[PDB]
Amino acid sequence: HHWGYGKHNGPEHWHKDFPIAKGERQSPVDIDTHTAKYDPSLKPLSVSYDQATSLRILNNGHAFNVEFDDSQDKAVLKGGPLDGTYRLIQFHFHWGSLDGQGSEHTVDKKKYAAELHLVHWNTKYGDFGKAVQQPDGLAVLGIFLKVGSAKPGLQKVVDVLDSIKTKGKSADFTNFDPRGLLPESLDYWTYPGSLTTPPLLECVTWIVLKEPISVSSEQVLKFRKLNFNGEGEPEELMVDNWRPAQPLKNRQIKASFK
Ligand SMILES: CN(CCOc1ccc(C[C@H]2SC(=O)NC2=O)cc1)c1ccccn1
Ligand SMILES: [Zn+2]
């Protein structure tokens, strides 16, 4: 009886195994656009993905992860609210059963169809496992997806999903350029939070882009054909793999833009 997104093991149950689920800096949150404060001291975000080396795509039973070589400073996030250098380790998405839900963060209570998370770790902690034990260990760049025109740069991801349908399947996934998943603007909101799955560690500086990317209905329909289950188990469609908004508590969301 392990955690997941069902009636019996979903977010409302996670606190039993992971009491930090009720902590002081949990994610995601609703972004109240009128109460976020413009912070003119926030720097532009530096996204340096020119040298990114993708390796593999994995269905881990909760999402699919596109994994990168993080053994050198090749794909790094710097600037914005961050001190020092954060290495890209993986990206994944959260999405819904319906276009009207799927994002983890919300904007004035609006749910997007999906949310992309580019996960980066602070190089001053040496490895990802050490970084998650630190309050400034990770930087996650969150990007909303809305359904409209196709995202050309997403299609290579969409087309490999047939090969990783079930939990524990992986495939080669080299030479994927994550710059093709970014919107035009790097305007962002930022706040201190957590991993949005168990172990729910309070180690993340969240950077959520204001501008969504557009993906087509066909692209997100292919996400929804993935399975939570392993091969030869009853089919459970991988849909609604999002944690809902958590209490903001004693936090301020800052805007990089007026
Ligand atoms: C290091 N580790 C393994 C898991 O740590 C995680 C890091 C990120 C994620 C993905 C989350 S965070 C986000 O933005 N969206 C997600 O889905 C999940 C687990 C540990 C460390 C201690 C105990 C157990 N495992
Ligand atoms: Zn995530």
Distance CA 81, CA 40 (A): 11
Q: Mind telling me the catalytic residues?
A: 62
Nearest Cα residue to 212 out of 88, 109, 105: 105
Name the closest-CA residue to atom 1, ligand 1.
Answer: 129
Residue among 68, 105, 119, 209 whose CB has most ligand 1 atoms within 8 A, to mutate: 119
Tokens describing residue 218: 């066909």
- Burial label for 65, CB within 10 Å (0-12, 13-18, 19+), is buried
What's the gap in Å between 195 CA and the centre of ligand 1?
A: 6
Spatial CB neighbours of 126, under 8 Å, sequence gap ≥ 6? none
Nominal resolution (angstroms): 1.3
- The amino acid at 128: F
Name the closest-CA residue to atom 2, ligand 1.
Answer: 129
The three-state secondary structure class of 87 is strand
Radius of gyration of the chain (CA): 17
CB atoms closer than 10 angstroms to residue 106: 20
Distance CA 201, CA 138 (A): 10
Tally the residues of the chain: 258
H or E element at residue 93: strand 86-95
| Residue where the block lists tokens 């292919």 | 222
Tokens describing residue 216: 């087509």
DSSP string for residues in 147-199: ESS--GGGHHHHHHGGGG-STT-EEE--S--GGGG--S---EEEEEE--SSTT
Tokens describing residue 196: 């949005």
Distance CA 30, CA 45 (A): 22
Distance CA 200, CA 121 (A): 16
Distance CA 96, CA 122 (A): 30
What's the gap in Å between 56 CA and the centre of ligand 2?
A: 17
The torsion defined by the Cα of 231, 232, 238 and 243, in degrees rounded to 10, comes to -90
The torsion defined by the Cα of 11, 15, 21 and 22, in degrees rounded to 10, comes to 120
What's the gap in Å between 244 CA and the centre of ligand 2?
A: 12
Does ligand 1 come within 6 angstroms of the Cβ of 195? yes
Does ligand 1 come within 6 angstroms of the Cβ of 248? no
Nearest Cα residue to 26 out of 177, 207, 224, 250: 250
196 labelled as ligand-binding?
yes
Can you say how many angstroms the Cα of residue 226 is from the centroid of all Cα atoms in its chain? 17
Atom of ligand 1 nearest to the CA of 104: 15
Q: Is the dihedral of CA 91, 239, 180, 66 positive or negative?
A: positive
The three-state secondary structure class of 223 is helix
CB atoms closer than 10 angstroms to residue 122: 23
Nearest Cα residue to 229 out of 7, 93, 61: 61
The torsion defined by the Cα of 204, 208, 213 and 215, in degrees rounded to 10, comes to 40
DSSP string for residues in 34-81: TTSEE-TTPPPEEEE-TT--EEEEEE-SSSEEEEE--SSSSSEEEETT
Ligand nearest to the backbone CA of 195: 1
Distance CA 227, CA 236 (A): 6
